[PDB]
Enzyme design. Structure first.
Site, PDB file in Angstrom:
ATOM      1  N   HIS A  84       0.847  -1.183   0.000  1.00 53.18           N
ATOM      2  CA  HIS A  84       0.000   0.000   0.000  1.00 53.18           C
ATOM      3  C   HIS A  84       0.877   1.225   0.000  1.00 53.18           C
ATOM      4  O   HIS A  84       2.098   1.094   0.000  1.00 53.18           O
ATOM      5  CB  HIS A  84      -1.129   0.011   1.058  1.00 53.18           C
ATOM      6  N   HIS A  86       1.504   3.858   2.047  1.00 50.35           N
ATOM      7  CA  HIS A  86       2.098   4.537   3.204  1.00 50.35           C
ATOM      8  C   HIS A  86       3.589   4.313   3.290  1.00 50.35           C
ATOM      9  O   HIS A  86       4.154   3.389   2.705  1.00 50.35           O
ATOM     10  CB  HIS A  86       1.406   4.091   4.496  1.00 50.35           C
ATOM     11  N   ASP A  88       5.618   3.153   5.473  1.00 50.52           N
ATOM     12  CA  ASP A  88       6.215   1.924   5.942  1.00 50.52           C
ATOM     13  C   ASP A  88       6.250   0.843   4.870  1.00 50.52           C
ATOM     14  O   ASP A  88       6.844  -0.229   5.072  1.00 50.52           O
ATOM     15  CB  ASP A  88       5.588   1.432   7.254  1.00 50.52           C
ATOM     16  N   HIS A 149      -7.277  -1.496   5.955  1.00 46.22           N
ATOM     17  CA  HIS A 149      -6.376  -0.496   6.531  1.00 46.22           C
ATOM     18  C   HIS A 149      -6.223   0.713   5.602  1.00 46.22           C
ATOM     19  O   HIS A 149      -6.081   1.853   6.058  1.00 46.22           O
ATOM     20  CB  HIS A 149      -5.029  -1.157   6.781  1.00 46.22           C
ATOM     21  N   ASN A 180      -2.820   3.359  12.750  1.00 40.60           N
ATOM     22  CA  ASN A 180      -3.208   4.532  12.020  1.00 40.60           C
ATOM     23  C   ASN A 180      -4.395   4.197  11.145  1.00 40.60           C
ATOM     24  O   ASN A 180      -4.236   3.505  10.142  1.00 40.60           O
ATOM     25  CB  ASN A 180      -2.016   5.069  11.193  1.00 40.60           C
TER      26      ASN A 180
HETATM   27  N1  LIG Z   1       0.961   2.285   7.370  1.00 43.01           N
HETATM   28  S1  LIG Z   1       0.690   3.595   8.269  1.00 43.01           S
HETATM   29  O1  LIG Z   1      -0.673   3.453   8.748  1.00 43.01           O
HETATM   30  O2  LIG Z   1       0.999   4.792   7.624  1.00 43.01           O
HETATM   31  C1  LIG Z   1       1.749   3.613   9.683  1.00 43.01           C
HETATM   32  C2  LIG Z   1       2.845   4.532   9.839  1.00 43.01           C
HETATM   33  S2  LIG Z   1       3.566   5.514   8.623  1.00 43.01           S
HETATM   34  O3  LIG Z   1       4.776   6.042   9.238  1.00 43.01           O
HETATM   35  O4  LIG Z   1       3.723   4.750   7.435  1.00 43.01           O
HETATM   36  C3  LIG Z   1       2.592   6.989   8.302  1.00 43.01           C
HETATM   37  C4  LIG Z   1       3.516   8.183   8.003  1.00 43.01           C
HETATM   38  C5  LIG Z   1       2.673   9.449   7.666  1.00 43.01           C
HETATM   39  N2  LIG Z   1       1.694   9.771   8.819  1.00 43.01           N
HETATM   40  C6  LIG Z   1       0.828   8.545   9.199  1.00 43.01           C
HETATM   41  C7  LIG Z   1       1.728   7.342   9.514  1.00 43.01           C
HETATM   42  C8  LIG Z   1       3.375   4.648  11.150  1.00 43.01           C
HETATM   43  C9  LIG Z   1       2.956   3.864  12.223  1.00 43.01           C
HETATM   44  C10 LIG Z   1       1.986   2.874  12.035  1.00 43.01           C
HETATM   45  C11 LIG Z   1       1.580   2.027  13.174  1.00 43.01           C
HETATM   46  C12 LIG Z   1       1.782   0.645  13.139  1.00 43.01           C
HETATM   47  C13 LIG Z   1       1.330  -0.128  14.248  1.00 43.01           C
HETATM   48  C14 LIG Z   1       0.689   0.496  15.356  1.00 43.01           C
HETATM   49  C15 LIG Z   1       0.142  -0.325  16.519  1.00 43.01           C
HETATM   50  C16 LIG Z   1       1.309  -0.974  17.252  1.00 43.01           C
HETATM   51  C17 LIG Z   1       0.786  -1.816  18.472  1.00 43.01           C
HETATM   52  N3  LIG Z   1      -0.269  -2.836  18.001  1.00 43.01           N
HETATM   53  C18 LIG Z   1      -1.434  -2.170  17.280  1.00 43.01           C
HETATM   54  C19 LIG Z   1      -0.873  -1.410  16.049  1.00 43.01           C
HETATM   55  C20 LIG Z   1       0.530   1.886  15.350  1.00 43.01           C
HETATM   56  C21 LIG Z   1       0.964   2.651  14.263  1.00 43.01           C
HETATM   57  C22 LIG Z   1       1.383   2.747  10.742  1.00 43.01           C
HETATM   58  C23 LIG Z   1       0.368   1.709  10.661  1.00 43.01           C
HETATM   59  N4  LIG Z   1       0.498   0.541   9.982  1.00 43.01           N
HETATM   60  N5  LIG Z   1      -0.581  -0.196  10.274  1.00 43.01           N
HETATM   61  N6  LIG Z   1      -1.358   0.502  11.089  1.00 43.01           N
HETATM   62  N7  LIG Z   1      -0.792   1.696  11.362  1.00 43.01           N
HETATM   63 ZN   LIG Z   2      -0.546   2.029   6.186  1.00 39.50          ZN
HETATM   64 ZN   LIG Z   3       1.920  -0.280   8.770  1.00 39.92          ZN
END
Ligand SMILES: NS(=O)(=O)c1c(S(=O)(=O)C2CCNCC2)ccc(-c2ccc(C3CCNCC3)cc2)c1-c1nnn[nH]1
Ligand SMILES: [Zn+2]
Ligand SMILES: [Zn+2]
Ligand SMILES: [Mg+2]
Length: 231
Positions: A84, A86, A88, A149, A180
């Site tokens: 996807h 994002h 990461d 997601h 997120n």
């Molecule tokens: N796939 S993203 O949403 O942009 C993502 C990013 S990110 O950095 O790519 C992006 C950059 C721009 N602003 C928004 C975030 C960061 C953290 C997280 C993130 C990951 C895990 C968690 C918790 C950890 C403990 N257990 C439950 C899940 C929290 C956050 C995620 C993510 N990936 N999937 N969901 N969120």
């Molecule tokens: Zn994401």
């Molecule tokens: Zn993620």
């Protein structure tokens, strides 16, 4: 019990974990908004080459990932798919591209990455725009389960090993929060998870985007996490 955890990986280092014959996950750590998170991707043997699924979340982590693959596996990474848009999943695409890896993503992912200001995979993956679509890509099947997601999230199945990589559409069993959700479809997410369950009933290993792999239980657990967030 040997899968590496977040406090075991300094930011900038990457670990590999053997999942099955010719299948590894890659594990890295990165900071976002002042908290450190672990993150997974996949490596799949493709004859005498490797297929990479997702970056190691950042330029320095992705360079460390390529170095780790070189010493542990010693086969070239020739192609990469991002699941996807994002950071990461695409942060580090420019490092892959400068290392000669051909980078791919669906047109949905490429448009969203472009709008976000994120790195953009070079090549477009057609045939994945409708929920339930599946295409072959080297040793994997790419599957679009529907919005979860994110609206563009893909999952990846390795038929030789019955491994399902869920990316950020699938949470680990210890998860108590939905991460997120800014770009998520909370109402469609359980339906998209049910589609995955229906399409890959023989999956033996399920790998989440963050945290520990497990079995098919990660799918129902993810639907439950999403429902708790909604409530
Ligand atoms: N796939 S993203 O949403 O942009 C993502 C990013 S990110 O950095 O790519 C992006 C950059 C721009 N602003 C928004 C975030 C960061 C953290 C997280 C993130 C990951 C895990 C968690 C918790 C950890 C403990 N257990 C439950 C899940 C929290 C956050 C995620 C993510 N990936 N999937 N969901 N969120
Ligand atoms: Zn994401
Ligand atoms: Zn993620
Ligand atoms: Mg240990």
């Amino acid at each position: 019990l040997e899968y590496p955890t977040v406090n075991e990986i300094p930011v900038g280092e990457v670990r590999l974990y053997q999942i099955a014959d010719g299948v590894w996950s890659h594990i890295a750590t990165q900071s976002f908004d002042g908290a450190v998170y672990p993150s997974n991707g996949l490596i799949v043997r493709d004859g005498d080459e490797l297929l990479l699924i997702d970056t190691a979340w950042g330029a320095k982590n992705t360079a460390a990932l390529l170095a780790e693959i070189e010493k542990q596996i010693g086969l070239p990474v020739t192609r990469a798919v991002s699941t996807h848009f994002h950071d990461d999943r695409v942060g580090g695409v420019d490092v892959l591209r400068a290392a000669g890896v051909a980078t791919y993503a669906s047109p949905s992912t490429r448009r969203l990455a472009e709008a976000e200001g994120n790195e953009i995979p070079t090549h477009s993956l057609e045939g994945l725009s409708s929920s339930g679509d599946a295409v072959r890509f080297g040793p994997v099947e790419l599957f679009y389960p529907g919005a979860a997601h994110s609206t563009d999230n893909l999952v990846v199945y390795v038929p030789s090993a019955n491994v399902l990589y869920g990316g950020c559409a699938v949470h680990e069993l210890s998860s108590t929060s939905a991460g997120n959700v800014a770009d998520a479809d909370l109402a469609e997410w359980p339906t998209s998870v049910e589609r995955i369950q229906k399409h890959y009933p023989e999956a033996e290993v399920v790998i989440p985007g963050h945290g520990l792999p497990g079995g098919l239980d990660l799918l129902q657990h993810t639907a439950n996490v999403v429902k708790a967030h909604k409530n």
